Design an enzyme around this catalytic site. Structure first.
Site, PDB file in Angstrom:
ATOM      1  N   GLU A  71       0.846  -1.182   0.000  1.00 49.06           N
ATOM      2  CA  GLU A  71       0.000   0.000   0.000  1.00 49.06           C
ATOM      3  C   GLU A  71       0.879   1.229   0.000  1.00 49.06           C
ATOM      4  O   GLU A  71       2.067   1.213   0.355  1.00 49.06           O
ATOM      5  CB  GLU A  71      -0.887  -0.055   1.235  1.00 49.06           C
ATOM      6  CG  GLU A  71      -0.214   0.130   2.611  1.00 49.06           C
ATOM      7  CD  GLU A  71      -1.202   0.541   3.686  1.00 49.06           C
ATOM      8  OE1 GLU A  71      -1.753   1.642   3.709  1.00 49.06           O
ATOM      9  OE2 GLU A  71      -1.404  -0.334   4.531  1.00 49.06           O
ATOM     10  N   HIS A 100     -10.601   4.125   3.076  1.00 45.99           N
ATOM     11  CA  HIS A 100      -9.935   3.377   4.100  1.00 45.99           C
ATOM     12  C   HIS A 100     -10.076   1.869   4.025  1.00 45.99           C
ATOM     13  O   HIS A 100     -10.429   1.219   5.032  1.00 45.99           O
ATOM     14  CB  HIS A 100     -10.447   3.749   5.535  1.00 45.99           C
ATOM     15  CG  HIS A 100      -9.493   4.781   6.080  1.00 45.99           C
ATOM     16  ND1 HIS A 100      -9.894   6.108   6.234  1.00 45.99           N
ATOM     17  CD2 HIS A 100      -8.198   4.617   6.483  1.00 45.99           C
ATOM     18  CE1 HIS A 100      -8.841   6.783   6.695  1.00 45.99           C
ATOM     19  NE2 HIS A 100      -7.836   5.895   6.835  1.00 45.99           N
TER      20      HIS A 100
END
Length: 108
Positions: A71, A100
């Site tokens: 990520e 998120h």
């Protein structure tokens, strides 16, 4: 810096690494980054959090043997981290999340 969905996705598929403006959470912390104070930009000017492995525990991203997820923060400039991330695999699949890691969509 290169910190847009497109800029980052195209650079990862080409050079196979993140642009120079990314640092992992551990590198950030060592420099004095305190998440609760949203001070990344004070202590690591022009840097964004990126390169950490993402477990994908909730199995929402396509899995495969020998596949790893990473990520990177997207659109970050200063303050507290936002909700935007790019998720990339060892085989270069690229996904995006703007909520998120609740939801994902393929971008590359």
């Amino acid at each position: 810096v290169i910190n847009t969905f497109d800029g980052v996705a195209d650079y990862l598929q080409t050079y196979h690494k993140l642009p120079d403006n990314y640092i992992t959470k551990s590198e950030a912390q060592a420099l004095g980054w305190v998440a609760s104070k949203g001070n990344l930009a004070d202590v690591a000017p022009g840097k964004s959090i990126g390169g950490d492995i993402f477990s994908n525990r909730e199995g929402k991203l396509p899995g495969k043997s020998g596949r790893t997820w990473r990520e990177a923060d997207i659109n970050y400039t200063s303050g507290f981290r936002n909700s935007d991330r790019v998720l990339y695999s060892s085989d270069w699949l690229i996904y995006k999340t703007t909520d998120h890691y609740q939801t994902f969509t393929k971008i590359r």
